[PDB]
Design a binder for this molecule. Structure first.
Ligand SMILES: O=c1cc[nH]c(=O)[nH]1
Ligand SMILES: O=c1cc[nH]c(=O)[nH]1
Ligand SMILES: O=c1cc[nH]c(=O)[nH]1
Ligand SMILES: O=c1cc[nH]c(=O)[nH]1
Lengths: 295, 295, 298, 295
């Protein structure tokens, strides 16, 4: 037998960093959960229980704390680059570092219409993430994304014209509720190394912002009979607005809301045009995915 | 042996209701999870396996759907009252109904600066709930509350002057991070029945909005060395701003952020006045509670 | 305005303790989650921001570790009592201590038929808990319980003869699936103090064992048309087997498994006597509760 | 822009199936959660909102129920294969089917030392899963696995001899607690079609059983100072005991238990040789992985 693959590292490293502006007195907070996995000439730890080739996970944790102390933790795309680069550069037997960052929301509070200098609210469970893969002599690969975005539109969504056979029972419809969680990932073009990445820093937040906006607006405005069709529209726009992205990927799990027939009770009318009360379903759920790249 | 207590019913009934303005076109959505537990002359179902006295849990379900169909589901306090009352009135052997209602956020989206007619976002996992106890001959007891509000303030909190003994290792502090989930409950004065409730409808949404604003503002503005002191101030204002409320209750589960000493590494300074990076702690956590009523 | 109530403390204190037997070389582990909430003359922390009356939550933490270090952590009823007692005894202004303990399963592993000296497996998400209320000059009240016990029986469960009216659509049945989580609490007769508690130590593990056995066996054996009727039988037996218990309380959340009509497809028969494939329902669910105590009759 | 990749389907389909022995009276249950994702000539749904190429997710759900009704649902490897094969055979435009199945434990109850005919207990949150890829012309790829197996050994584990630099603070140790959730997967050698699979049916349950036993035994018995080392030994034995397996893959998320220094209190001894009470850490946690194959 032989080791075909191997990674090890620290997961769920919660980090919090505050930024204070001495002048204005305004404080800004950043809180993420970090995961670093190393790859390299570490087989013998597996085959001959050799720990000499092992950088302790505990130390990988220390390293995350120290790196965050001495560098900007935002955008996450930068921080992940800086961090993964450190691993390949400081150790001769480490050849690849895979950094995953999840950024949690700490929205500044508006008290009396003015933004509070140092008070935040977790205004949603939505997350902004990055998966940075820094490989030796192969550059830096960055996948950015947003996840945990939950939306619903009460109308302006239909589903008809789908295949029908002896397994079909679903009725066609020209008005329905559409609710989903959005998971949207945009892959950047390979970067040669840290410098190239620093050069593009402003593109990061911008693109995130753009991707969010596009998703929300398109979801709201599109009156479609295809979730597939809608996602694709989203993709296109993102690709159009940022040349440095190679692919865009969308995963939408479709949360269903069923009509409740109440006719059996005093001929109560609650379906079709009369539907008012529905039963949200916890499961199962449709799942639609797609990766869209350039022609 | 004897039955000293007994309740049964249906839990986790998910309900969705839409409101359509034919004129303006604007739609509005309401989603909530409902639990209804009944009390009455049911012993015999326990003692002699007699099902005759049992209104099925499935029918309690149907009832919820039917009630929602034919009544306003907002405010929650009203809906809970209508629902509870239904049970004690329609059944001779049923003498108490306990209705729990958890309301989920479906905040209308702003596209391009304008509120969208029919598109919503789950803009937070915070919930607005109500526990409504409808007891025969005793009227209607309503507990209203907000939960799942998570907040953080990077400074303007201290802790010092606490009891010190042989079990004490905590160091006193004049600048610390304060984060907590907020669970706030205000109890209304007993209502005589459905009509007295209906008469007060406007106070419900109004009080909720007050309770929340007071909480947010006081948290942000108070620079205290007592979370206890802060919670108390919150209570006072709420009781002050609304005569019909008998008690206000707060439960704050603290979330600790620890300082990380990095001095062992190149004498890096990251504590006291230099603290920048902190370690968010998943557990354990402080838990402070208190019920405040009128003098 | 005035403070009508007030409790503060530390929640979610995770604790693990190992016991070694130097002779046999066998090792035993205990892991629980602990919450301690204090009550007393502390109003001033709320009204006048006075921290002098506050034992810091961090110190409540240290105290749990230290107590765990110098005392048995089992049974949890004992530990909780020792722990609660400590707070009222060491502070003059603290009059009540409420300790909640959740015990986690770390079941010894059987390797090649033989119990392993030091290896364990989390063989289930069922918990054994205790709620211990130590109030000054009012003794020690103990509520013991098991939770997170999930069971299912594929048959020998019915539901018919229930009230029918204009809200009813449920069809009567003589064979159905019964699945539930079991939450069972037995409340002990008040104890004067730590001594009384120590004197009854053996009763603890035994009653827990009994409660669990009675629940499983009754559930399995009872062919009922009432979950209520089944819970009630369980209560009785527990009460019968232990005189020091004042009340038994059961809370069973009923998880439903629907029948799936497939007749629309090639006249497929999957209902009634031919039901084989069901759709388990995540929600909603029935919830049945009841507290049973001892009769005043003779 | 162009559609580089696209799948869609039904997630979280809970299915329950009972087996009744008319002779013995003994019943047996099976509960699993199923996900089916289809791949094929479906681009147009994305690009031209064409639903004619879309087999409704609902119908995929109906199919799962139907298939379960007319086929064995055990071993999952088989069911998955039958299920995925159905999709590529019945639809001309569908060329891939990806079926995921999670199996929940419903262990038979021992009442008075005798196995009960129809009573079960969820005796663990440990799962047995399968991922079955059915690609037209490419055969059937099956990954089998066990997950959610949590274990802890109080002693007979050390960690010393690992790399030490300026980022290191971890002390070496000759006795330490070792706890971890185990996620173990074994990949089968490609099968040509449903028949080849049918022909190996018995190997499925047998290998699952072996994989489990090997993992428990090795974990218990191995006195190592390398989790990497231990994992490896587990994989070797699994490969050794079953020729049809191509690779075995372990993911071990290490759960830490810290020592608690209590010396500051009346010189209490609770470290090193005297360690009795420990603080289990919720996070962060080490994570070791590795894929082992044949030399
Ligand atoms: O009691 C306590 C303990 C810690 N921090 C507070 O604000 N109060
Ligand atoms: O009341 C009820 C209703 C359904 N099923 C039960 O066991 N009890
Ligand atoms: O394929 C499908 C099925 C259901 N609903 C959609 O939007 N797409
Ligand atoms: O690197 C490490 C650290 C802790 N435990 C392991 O198995 N490996």
């Amino acid at each position: 037998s032989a080791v075909k693959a191997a990674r090890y590292g620290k997961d769920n490293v919660r980090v919090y960093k505050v930024h204070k502006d001495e002048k204005t007195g305004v404080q800004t907070v950043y809180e993420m959960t970090v995961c670093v996995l190393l790859e390299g000439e570490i087989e013998t730890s597996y085959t001959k229980a050799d720990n000499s080739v092992i950088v302790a996970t505990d130390s990988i944790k220390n390293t995350i704390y120290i790196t965050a102390k001495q560098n900007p933790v935002t955008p996450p795309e930068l921080f992940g680059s800086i961090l993964g680069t450190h691993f390949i550069e400081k150790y001769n037997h480490i050849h690849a570092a895979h950094v995953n960052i999840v950024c949690h929301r700490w929205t500044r509070m508006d008290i009396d219409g003015k933004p509070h200098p140092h008070s935040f609210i977790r205004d949603s469970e939505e997350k902004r993430n990055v998966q940075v893969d820094v490989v030796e002599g192969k550059g830096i690969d960055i996948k950015s994304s947003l996840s945990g975005l939950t939306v619903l539109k009460s109308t302006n969504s239909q589903f008809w014209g789908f295949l029908r056979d002896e397994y079909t029972t679903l009725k066609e419809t020209w008005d329905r509720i559409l609710s989903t969680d959005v998971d949207a990932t945009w892959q950047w073009k390979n970067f040669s190394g840290l410098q190239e990445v620093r050069s593009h820093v402003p593109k990061f937040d911008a693109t995130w912002a753009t991707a969010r906006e596009v998703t929300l607006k398109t979801f709201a405005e599109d009156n479609s009979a295809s979730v597939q069709a809608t996602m694709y529209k989203m993709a296109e726009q993102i690709l159009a607005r940022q040349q440095l992205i190679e692919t865009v990927e969308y995963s939408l799990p479709n949360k269903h809301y069923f009509e409740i027939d109440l006719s059996w009770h005093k001929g109560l009318q609650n379906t079709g045009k009369n539907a008012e009360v529905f039963a949200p379903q916890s499961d199962p759920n449709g799942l639609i995915k797609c990766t869209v790249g350039r022609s």
